[PDB]
Amino acid sequence: DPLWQDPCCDRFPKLLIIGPQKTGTTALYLFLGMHPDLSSNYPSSETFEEIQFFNGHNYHKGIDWYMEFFPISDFYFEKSANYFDSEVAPRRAAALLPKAKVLTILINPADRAYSWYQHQRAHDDPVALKYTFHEVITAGSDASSKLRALQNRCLVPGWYATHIERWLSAYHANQILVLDGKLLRTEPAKVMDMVQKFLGVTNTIDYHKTLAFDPKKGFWCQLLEGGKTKCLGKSKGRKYPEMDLDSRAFLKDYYRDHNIELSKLLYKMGQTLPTWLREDLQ
């Protein structure tokens, strides 16, 4: 395992959206790319919009492998929801891009866990298709290894504070931005504003004016000519049943403490507490 150091250049991302998954990363990624001054990486035929360099096996491929993803607009960014959870990504990223901006998006952990479950079912994951949500989150003494594994993938990434500390040890607080996932989905133009301000955007664009709520889609989309909308794909904003109330409550109890710690950490980081977080904490 190596540790690519800062080569200095201009062909490197200046912002990293580390996830986690199912928090609205693709939407932030899509809306940000709309700003004429900000440019995303080119898609991978294996990981699509994501690069996934710092997290796992792709990192030992070298710096040039990474640089190729970016154009040769003068501010690039990449998104890999796998970075948030990654243990090694923080220091590996800090070593190569010490001055990079780090952005993360948080939604209620319970819904984030539910979305992952629904996500694995959509991709026809057998363990996810075989067990119900409650069975996954309460997987126990009679639970299989695969079932247990799916539970970890639903719940662990939701220990927001734990992972944010790993990134906070590799990056200064003023180089990190914790977004409200609920606000991004409910009022995207509001967070698109905080992001721009956070990136030091010279010519701020108003998204209120050129985004729009698509009722048949149930989410915001890009406003085009004459009412028209360009929304995210079918795999984004999947149509499934509201999560069980008992399951919700069960998870509410489980994260209570994680959420207490998060509230303290963010405050200490100088980040505004997410709406969903204030409610859960009351």
Ligand X SMILES: Nc1ncnc2c1ncn2[C@@H]1O[C@H](COP(=O)(O)O)[C@@H](OP(=O)(O)O)[C@H]1O
* Residues contributing to the annotated binding site for adenosine 3',5'-bisphosphate: 22-26, 115, 220, 236-240
Residue 249 sits at the vertex; the CA angle it makes with 138 and 86, to the nearest 5 degrees, is 60
Provide the minimum distance between the beta carbon of 35 and ligand X in the complex, in angstroms, as a whole number: 16
Determine, following the binding rule CB under 6 A, whether residue 24 of this chain makes contact with ligand X.
yes
x/- track of binding to ligand X for residues 64-83 (CB under 6 A): -----------------x--
Q: How far is the CB of 238 from ligand X (least distance, A)?
A: 4
Q: Is 238 in the site for ligand X (CB under 6 A)?
A: yes
Name the one range near ligand X by CB under 6 A: 24-32, 141-149, 168-176, 267-275. 24-32
Yes or no: say if 15 and 50 are a contact pair by the CB < 8 Å rule: no
Q: CB under 6 A: which stretch of 18-26, 129-137, 251-259, 265-273 binds ligand X?
A: 18-26
Interface with ligand X (CB under 6 A), residue total 18
- The tally of CA atoms less than 13 A away on the side-chain side of residue 32 is 28
Q: State which of positions 178-197 bind ligand X (CB under 6 A).
A: 184-185
Q: Is 230 a catalytic residue?
A: no
Stretch that binds ligand X, among 21-29, 54-62, 161-169, 241-249 (CB under 6 A): 21-29
52 contributes a contact to ligand X by CB under 6 A: no
Catalytic residue among 22, 79, 101, 182: 22
Of 12, 23, 176, 259, which lies in the binding site for ligand X, with binding defined by CB under 6 A?
Answer: 23
Render the chain in DSSP notation, one character per residue: ---------TTSEEEEE---TTSSHHHHHHHHHTSTTEEEPPPBTTTBT----SSSGGGGG-HHHHHTTS----EEEEE-TTTTT-SSHHHHHHHH-TT-EEEEEE--HHHHHHHHHHHHHHTT-HHHHHS-HHHHHT--TT--HHHHHHHHHHHGGG-HHHHHHHHHTTS-GGGEEEEEHHHHHH-HHHHHHHHHHHHT-SS---SGGGEEEETTTTEEEEE-STT-EE---TTSS---PPPPHHHHHHHHHHHHHHHHHHHHHHHHHTPPPPHHHHHHH-
Answer yes or no whether residue 237 interacts with ligand X by CB under 6 A. Answer: yes
Site for ligand X in 103-162 (CB under 6 A): 115, 118
17-25, 61-69, 191-199, 244-252 -> range binding ligand X (CB under 6 A)? 17-25
Asked whether position 94 contacts ligand X by CB under 6 A, the answer is no
Burial class (CB in 10 A: 0-12, 13-18, 19+), 162: middle
Does 25 engage in binding with ligand X (CB under 6 A)? yes
Q: Name the minimum Å distance from CB 21 to ligand X.
A: 5
Q: Known binding site: residues?
A: 22-26, 115, 220, 236-240
- Rounded to an integer, what distance in angstroms lies between the CA atom of residue 192 and that of residue 207? 7
Catalytic residues: 22
Residues of this chain that bind ligand X (CB under 6 A): 21-27, 81, 115, 118, 184-185, 219-220, 232, 236-238
